[PDB]
A paper describes a structure:
In the pathogenesis of Alzheimer’s disease, the overexpression of glycogen synthase kinase-3β (GSK-3β) stands out due to its multifaced nature, as it contributes to the promotion of amyloid β and tau protein accumulation, as well as neuroinflammatory processes. GSK-3β abnormal activity leads to hyperphosphorylation of tau protein which results in the formation of neurofibrillary tangles and the loss of its fundamental property–stabilization of microtubules. GSK-3β activity also plays a significant role in the modulation of immune response within the central nervous system (CNS). Given the multifaceted role of GSK-3β in the processes contributing to the onset and progression of Alzheimer’s disease, it represents an excellent biological target in the pursuit of disease treatment.
We identified compound 36, demonstrating an IC50 of 70 nM against GSK-3β. The most potent compound developed in this study is 36 with an IC50 of 70 nM. Kinetic studies confirmed a competitive type of inhibition, allowing for the determination of a Ki value (Ki = 60.3 nM) consistent with the IC50 (for details including Lineweaver–Burk and Cornish–Bowden plots see Figures S26 and S27 in the SI). The electron density map shows the phosphorylation of Tyr216 that supports the active conformation of the A-loop, forming interactions with Arg220 and Arg223.44,45 The ligand’s electron density unambiguously determines the geometric orientation of compound 36 in the catalytic pocket of the enzyme. The aminopyridine fragment is oriented toward Asp133, Tyr134, and Val135 of the hinge region. An additional favorable contribution stabilizing the ligand in the hinge region is provided by the CH–O H-bond between the Asp133 main chain oxygen and the C(2) hydrogen of the pyridine ring, reflecting the tridentate harboring motif in the adenine binding region. The thiophene and the 1,2,4-oxadiazole rings are coplanar, with the latter located in the phosphate-binding region of GSK-3β where the residues Lys85, Asp200, and Phe67 create the anchoring motif. The 1,2,4-oxadiazole ring is capturing Lys85 with an H-bond and the thiophene ring of the inhibitor forms favorable London dispersion interactions with Cys199 and Val70. Although the position of the ligand in the pocket is entirely clear from the solved electronic density, the relative orientation of terminal groups cannot be unequivocally determined unless the resolution is <1.0 Å.47 Two orientations are distinguishable for the 1,2,4-oxadiazole: (i) the O atom in oxadiazole is exposed to the solvent, leaving the N–C bond oriented toward catalytic Lys85 (N–C orientation); (ii) the O atom in oxadiazole is turned toward the catalytic Lys85 (N–O orientation).
Author numbering: 36 to 119, 122 to 295, 300 to 381
The structure:
């Protein structure tokens, strides 16, 4: 049937208006609770409702971040409402329903042994670094960059950052947990038990999803944090004593105490391999900033005026830059916004 509730509009002021929707179905689950998909009775727009349980004697870090974020490549928080077993409540996050994720379209290609077109790979990754450079400016680290958290529309080719329950405003001094992120996309510093990491861990996970697109399979598949490090050393090579010191110092076992360059599939664009190399660096500082990655030579086909999607539709919102977005090296604005 239909259901109406009083929700405070996200990002906007505290003016709880009434929202009514129908046709609710579960599109996902998790430890937080469950995410639904409903249809707003007005305009018939399909949304997503994330029912996360929360103790009333606190404040959801996700909700605080989502209300302070507004970017084309980030799923906007439309509204939010509570619908609660004593000192607890269920926080429901109403967001725009993006119809697909990068993992699903990547799996559909992997099920047929076909590489995703580089045009798709270049547009998705660029929209990822654009959302990263946005959230990284405010000092927020997603801490869960994965293809399942990279929503995408098939027609408009618009990608948006999905989850934010693992994100935290990384401040100086404040120690944060190490065992974060998905294993296949976890940075090496987190495996070594570093509590002083920066937002460059999202860049490592960005380099991992890039390789998964140019290879049809996860680049670093392990069953444990230690096993994940063996996959990294097998490809990236043995980290030197400086890089092991650039991250947290710790001793670790291994299957053996043993850097193949030819790892990517044939016909892989060399410009992407150069980008993926600057992203998957042992040293967290050598990793390109999300804005520095946007200005890479691999993202030059999109910066061309005559760029167009396969279905004839023009390039989606590729520019639309803000001063906050360019807080890291504003000089690079001419490469992020060509005269085109
Ligand atoms: O899920 C699907 N669309 C979908 C999802 C979301 C989400 C937002 C937050 C989410 C979450 N947080 C933790 O865990 N999940 S999920 C938003 C919009 N559309 C269908 C198409 C595949």
């Amino acid at each position: 049937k239909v259901t109406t509730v009083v929700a405070t509009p996200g990002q906007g002021p505290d003016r709880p208006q009434e929202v009514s929707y129908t046709d609710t179905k579960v599109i996902g689950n998790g430890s937080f609770g469950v995410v639904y998909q409903a249809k707003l009775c007005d305009s018939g727009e399909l949304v997503a409702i994330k029912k996360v349980l929360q103790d009333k004697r606190f404040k959801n870090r996700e909700l605080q971040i989502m209300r302070k974020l507004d970017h084309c490549n980030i799923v906007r928080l439309r509204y939010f409402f509570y619908s609660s077993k004593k000192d607890e409540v269920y926080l429901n996050l109403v967001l725009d329903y993006v119809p697909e994720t990068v993992y699903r379209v990547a799996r559909h290609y992997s099920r047929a042994k076909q590489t995703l077109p580089v045009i798709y790979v270049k547009l998705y990754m660029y929209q990822l670094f654009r959302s990263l450079a946005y959230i990284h400016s405010f000092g927020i680290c997603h801490r869960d960059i994965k293809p399942q958290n990279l929503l995408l529309d098939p027609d408009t080719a618009v990608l948006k950052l999905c989850d934010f329950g693992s994100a935290k405003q990384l401040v100086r001094g404040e120690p944060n947990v190490s065992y974060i992120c998905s294993r296949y996309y976890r940075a090496p510093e987190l495996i070594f038990g570093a509590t002083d990491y920066t937002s460059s861990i999202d860049v490592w996970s960005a380099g991992c999803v890039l390789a998964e697109l140019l290879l049809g399979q996860p680049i670093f598949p392990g069953d444990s944090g230690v096993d994940q490090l063996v996959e990294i050393i097998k490809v990236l090579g043995t980290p030197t004593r400086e890089q092991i010191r650039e991250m947290n110092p710790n001793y670790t076992e291994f299957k053996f105490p043993q850097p193949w360059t030819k790892v990517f599939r044939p016909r892989t664009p060399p410009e992407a391999i150069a980008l993926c190399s600057r992203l998957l660096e042992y040293t967290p500082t050598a990793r390109l900033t999300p804005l520095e990655a946007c200005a890479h030579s691999f993202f030059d086909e999109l910066r061309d005026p005559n760029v167009k999607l396969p279905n004839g539709r023009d390039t989606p919102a590729l520019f639309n830059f803000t001063t906050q977005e360019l807080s890291s090296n504003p000089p690079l604005a001419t490469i992020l916004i060509p005269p085109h």
